[PDB]
Write a protein that binds this ligand. Structure first.
Ligand SMILES: NC(=O)C1=CN([C@@H]2O[C@H](COP(=O)(O)OP(=O)(O)OC[C@H]3O[C@@H](n4cnc5c(N)ncnc54)[C@H](OP(=O)(O)O)[C@@H]3O)[C@@H](O)[C@H]2O)C=CC1
Ligand SMILES: [Zn+2]
Lengths: 115, 146, 209, 87, 96, 129, 342
């Protein structure tokens, strides 16, 4: 039962393939989305935001899912290009308001019963 | 009928003694600093522990590890169990080996120094069921309790 | 049916859908797994995933079936079943005033080629399924998040998605803009355990599986 | 302290690998204990687990050795060397 | 009978009385707490006890359909005037 | 039986990245199963037949106002349903989640004999019905 | 902690942090941001308001249900303070008027009320108090801004033994009347500043860095008594502000080194309008005066709060002044001002 239907990625390379131009478009996308949307964010930290998003999920090996984030990431890009998304939506990725969650067991302990 | 005990006299804050030796509400830093300071300059037999009765094994592992890294391996308990012989050595010496689910077919039970009616009510319930059905013959040494 | 409490049954059409169900079953036995009708004169014929094109193309074009009115494109999550997502079609015949209903099974990833050709009504429904349940459909003209919020995360009608959600919103002065903080409810949803532990209906009871 | 405090074994009731230690604590267990009216060996017998050894030396020094399929005559050799250096 | 706390804070029939150290008392200045002065405990206490010579008395509570379900009241306890759980109206058995 | 360029997926399915749950809510959330014990006051049994996905309980602080139990645990109110434990774990592993197991509480054989309740040399005689 | 004062929650809106921060005069700039920070993790911030409730209405959204408890108060009334800080476990002073009012002599706004709220708070039974001084607080300076600040600073220091006094530098923010001010010479005239700016070095600080300072000072127990100074990341010679601000707004640069003599006249004429003294005689020498280093008192950097550069965020306040043709211009098109600093 290991053999199942693929979406677009017949192999790993095609999954690697689709990630490529997805970043090609998105890397070409950061400077202007800031420019039109009047975001007070420099281009540089916009670009590597896409970078660490890209390997915040670049750990799974199943070829059926990796291209599903490709189309999901593909269309999260489409919604941004044509001023559908607003200032709150672009900034929403740039997490601002919440304090950093605890790092050491000392900080987990001092906040509360939460782990 | 023990949930109401949870609400009465419940410790909620790090409780330390003030300059008058009166227990007072303080943050975690003071309580942590108080214990940490007096344990650094004390090793070996200078540190020990007294195990309670209702503390999980997870804290037991932590307190064994905490004392042994200080080389304070004197992890003492409350219920005194004779160390002479193989008490702590062999698990058989401190186990209900036959298991409560197994005591059914036993012909005779020699209870030694026990009042299971109150000492362990669930244990006494299982004997009574086996007493009524399996014709179990119990035998208690000591007080002629009910 | 002298008693007025229960609704009367209607047998003449009840046999008619079953006859039509076998009629559809014999024509295309490659894709019909099983067909059955319920008490309330509602027939359902069950199709295989890759069968969205011809079965509807059948019902849309057959001279003796001609079911063209696309009713609804629903999905029903069943976590127990491996293919938890169950895409459900529904067609109405104008001339024969009947309601066919075909449903398939699909995993989270496995696609369905878009049935916008047989019914362009499905196109706008198709957007909702990937928004509402999240099942992607193959070769769809424009399959968009159309009903949920912009840049939402996940699929809310997956039964693993909290009713309250994951992100709450508020207007923040220090940014002069709406910021999406994680949810922090004023009151917790007081779930109610509403399941009588006695047998409800001996009829529909599941035997020891 | 270089001396061992708790010498912890972990054997199974049915494992053939644990059979060697099973024979060990069947005949030479009492001899091991009477030679040590002191720091004991911790049996903590279990099921379907490969026979395992922990040495709880003093001042937080622990280390393990594997005893799967290890005969009774020479599991005593194994515990001999670790307890050989204790003073 | 509404009772006041040391800081002039009148208590409710449930017994809630925020102490001075409670920070949650600041919503109370410049404004007021609404207190149901008709304390539900003592507008039932003054109500008398009716005398019915039967072992079981119905307790519809008047108003016919406008009331509480007619739970039947057992009346044989000489030391305890049988009251209804719904309405609390104490019923009594003539002193033999 | 389904031959259309099928990919031989030998790795266990991990759909965790699609559902987009927060990262603190996929690792720091012990997920557990069991078949509910019957409510001892209710002799009915038609509830101990399904496995469920329930989570660990986080803190419940009282509201500064009237006193609702304000919570920030979105996953707490997520009692799922499962026909069999094999399907239960299948959901658990498919979106890989730190999980534990539990065995179905199975009844034992109640050897009942109403004729036993009355006897001559047997002690199971009952004094009052 | 008190039975209900004990904290609880994940820092959400409906999470009790156990800090009851009654802030004084929050209806402007720093008050708006601190309550925003105060209400973020949840706290009973009792704000005594004195103006029309309409102008205080915009503080409501940054608080959970029953959190932003506006309370009527008056500066002269002794009992007015005692009612608003009676149950507040912490008191954050923010009173003070950067401009002048006939009824409010400049001594009062930094001596009378700050002393008039510090002693009541200590009599009520509070734990902490934070009165906001100025980084340049100095009575001997010709600045009545500085003259009133310093004497009041030590009064609350003397009155309150645990008075954690904060001395921030020239804060900047959306309504700082410092950046939007320095954009306003183009509207007013030909930049009548003194000596073309080559006589004054200042160290602006972004307000959120300041506001995060107090709340971090709230959780810090050792902050009592210690007099923390909130200083920006880099200093800036006065001329660099003028050209940079006129650059990040695309304004016609018309600098003019008007000496102090005639620039003092325009101060009173700006106070002439009996609705708001746009610029005061105090504000004449206020900008001419430079900021002393003040290195001995601890700063926010050791308190866990870093400092955000001014040039990092300018159009966030200055895009409003940018004309339609250049409203879209960000920092990158504009050169950074010369960082005349340490
Ligand atoms: N760069 C700067 O501007 C710096 C300023 N400071 C000081 O910080 C304090 C607050 O600054 P900021 O928030 O920007 O100022 P704002 O002018 O924006 O707000 C000042 C606040 O003080 C209140 N207030 C002042 N005097 C009285 C009074 N007599 N009675 C009642 N309320 C009064 C006001 O209430 P209302 O609006 O109702 O009048 C208002 O809420 C001031 O003392 C300021 O000088 C310190 C360091 C740097
Ligand atoms: Zn009644």
């Amino acid at each position: 039962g290991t053999s199942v239907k693929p979406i677009f990625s017949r192999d790993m390379n095609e999954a690697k393939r689709r990630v490529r131009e997805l970043y090609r478009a998105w890397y070409r996308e950061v400077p202007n989305t800031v420019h039109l949307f009047q975001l007070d964010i420099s281009v540089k930290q916009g670009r590597d935001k896409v970078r660490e998003m890209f390997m915040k999920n670049a750990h799974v090996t199943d070829p059926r899912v990796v291209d599903l984030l490709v189309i999901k990431g593909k269309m999260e890009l489409e919604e941004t290009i044509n001023v559908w998304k607003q200032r709150t939506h672009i900034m929403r990725f740039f997490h601002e308001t919440e304090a950093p969650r605890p790092t050491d067991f000392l900080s987990k302990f001092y906040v509360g019963h939460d782990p | 009928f023990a949930y109401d005990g949870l609400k009465r006299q419940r410790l909620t804050q790090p409780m330390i003694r003030n300059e008058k030796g009166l227990l007072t509400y303080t943050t975690w830093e003071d309580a942590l600093s108080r214990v940490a300071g007096m344990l650094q300059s004390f090793q070996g037999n200078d540190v020990a522990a007294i195990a309670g009765g209702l503390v999980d094994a997870e804290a037991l592992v932590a307190l064994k590890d905490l004392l042994n890294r200080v080389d304070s391996d004197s992890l003492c308990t409350e219920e005194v169990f004779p160390t002479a012989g193989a008490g702590t050595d062999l698990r058989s010496n401190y186990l209900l080996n036959t298991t409560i689910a197994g005591v059914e077919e036993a012909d005779v039970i020699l209870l030694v120094g026990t009042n299971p009616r109150f000492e362990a009510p669930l244990f006494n319930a299982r004997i009574r069921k086996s007493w009524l059905h399996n014709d179990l013959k119990v035998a208690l040494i000591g007080s002629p309790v009910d | 049916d002298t008693r007025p409490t229960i609704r009367p049954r209607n047998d003449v059409v009840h046999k008619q859908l079953s006859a039509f169900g076998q009629y559809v079953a014999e024509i295309l036995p490659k894709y019909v797994q099983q067909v059955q009708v319920s008490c309330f004169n509602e027939l359902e014929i069950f199709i295989h995933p890759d069968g969205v094109i011809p079965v509807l193309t059948f019902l849309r074009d057959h001279t003796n079936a001609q079911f063209k009115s696309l009713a609804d494109l629903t999905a029903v999550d069943v976590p127990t079943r491996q293919n938890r997502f169950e895409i459900v079609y529904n067609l109405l015949s104008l001339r024969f005033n009947s309601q066919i209903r075909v449903k398939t099974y699909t995993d989270e990833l496995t696609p369905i080629e878009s049935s916008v050709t047989v019914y362009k009504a499905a196109n706008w429904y198709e957007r909702e399924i990937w928004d509402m349940f999240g099942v992607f459909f193959a070769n769809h003209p424009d399959l968009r998040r159309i009903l949920t919020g912009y840049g939402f995360e996940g699929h809310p009608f997956r039964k693993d998605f909290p009713l309250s959600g994951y992100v709450e919103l508020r207007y923040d002065d220090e940014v002069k803009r709406v910021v999406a903080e994680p949810v922090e409810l004023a009151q917790e949803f007081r779930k109610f355990d509403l399941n009588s532990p006695w047998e409800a209906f001996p009829a529909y009871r599941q035997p020891p599986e | 302290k270089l001396g061992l405090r708790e010498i912890r074994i972990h054997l199974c009731q049915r494992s053939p690998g644990s059979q060697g230690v099973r024979d060990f604590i069947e005949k030479r267990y009492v001899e091991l204990k009477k030679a040590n009216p002191d720091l004991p060996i911790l049996i903590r017998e279990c099921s379907d687990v490969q026979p395992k050894l922990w040495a709880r030396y003093a001042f937080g020094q622990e280390k393990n050795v594997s005893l799967n399929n290890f005969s009774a005559d020479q599991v005593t050799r194994t515990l001999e060397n670790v307890l050989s250096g204790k003073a | 009978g509404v009772r006041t706390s040391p800081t002039g804070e009148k208590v409710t029939h449930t017994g809630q009385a925020y102490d001075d150290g409670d920070y949650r008392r600041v919503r109370f200045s410049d404004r007021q707490k609404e207190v149901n002065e008709n304390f539900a405990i003592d507008l039932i206490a003054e109500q008398p006890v009716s005398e019915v010579g039967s072992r079981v008395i119905s307790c519809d509570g008047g108003g016919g359909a406008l009331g509480h379900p007619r739970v039947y009241i057992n009346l044989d306890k000489e030391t305890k005037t049988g009251t209804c759980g719904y309405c609390g109206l104490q019923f009594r058995q003539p002193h033999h | 039986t389904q031959d259309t360029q099928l990919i031989a997926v030998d790795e266990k399915l991990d759909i965790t990245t699609l559902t987009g749950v927060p990262e603190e809510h996929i690792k720091t959330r012990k997920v557990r199963i069991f078949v509910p014990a019957r409510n001892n006051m209710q002799s009915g049994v038609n509830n101990t037949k399904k496995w469920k996905m329930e989570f660990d309980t986080r803190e419940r602080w009282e509201n500064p106002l009237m006193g609702w139990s304000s919570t920030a645990d979105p996953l707490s109110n997520l009692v799922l349903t499962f026909s069999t434990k094999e399907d239960a774990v299948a959901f658990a592993e498919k979106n890989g989640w730190s999980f534990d197991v539990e065995e179905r509480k199975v009844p034992k054989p109640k050897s009942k004999s109403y004729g036993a309740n009355f006897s001559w040399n047997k002690r199971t005689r009952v004094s009052t019905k | 902690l008190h039975h209900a004062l004990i904290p609880h929650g994940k820092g959400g809106r409906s999470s009790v942090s156990g800090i009851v921060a009654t802030v004084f005069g929050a209806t402007g700039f720093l008050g708006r941001y601190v309550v925003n920070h105060l209400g973020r993790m949840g706290s009973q911030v009792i704000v005594p308001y004195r103006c029309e409730p309409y102008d205080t209405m915009h503080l409501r959204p940054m608080g959970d249900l029953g959190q932003i408890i506006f309370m009527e108060w008056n500066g002269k009334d002794k009992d007015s303070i005692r009612k608003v800080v009676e149950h507040s476990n912490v008191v954050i002073n923010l009173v003070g008027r950067e401009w002048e009012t006939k009824n409010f002599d400049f001594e009062d706004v930094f001596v009378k009320i700050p002393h008039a709220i510090a002693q009541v708070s200590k009599e009520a039974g509070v734990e902490k108090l934070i009165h906001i001084s100025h980084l340049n607080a100095d009575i001997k300076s010709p600045s009545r801004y500085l003259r009133s600040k310093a004497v009041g600073e030590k009064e609350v220091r003397a009155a309150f033994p645990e008075a954690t006094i904060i001395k921030p530098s020239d804060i900047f923010g959306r309504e700082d009347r410092f950046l939007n001010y320095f954009a306003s010479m183009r509207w007013f005239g030909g930049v009548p500043l003194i000596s073309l700016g080559k006589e004054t070095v200042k160290q602006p600080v972004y307000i959120v860095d300041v506001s995060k300072g107090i709340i971090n000072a709230i959780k810090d127990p050792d902050a009592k008594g210690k007099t923390f100074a909130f200083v920006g990341p880099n200093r800036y010679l006065l001329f660099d502000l003028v050209q940079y601000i006129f650059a990040v707004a695309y304004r016609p640069f018309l600098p003019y080194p008007l000496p102090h003599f005639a620039y003092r006249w325009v101060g009173r004429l700006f106070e002439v309008s009996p609705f708001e003294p746009w610029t005061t005689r105090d504000k004449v020498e206020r900008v001419h005066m430079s900021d002393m280093t003040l290195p001995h008192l601890p700063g926010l950097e050791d308190l866990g709060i870093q400092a955000t550069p001014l040039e990092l965020k300018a159009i966030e306040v200055l895009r409003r002044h940018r004309t339609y043709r250049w409203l879209t211009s960000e920092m990158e098109d504009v050169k950074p001002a010369k960082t005349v600093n340490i």
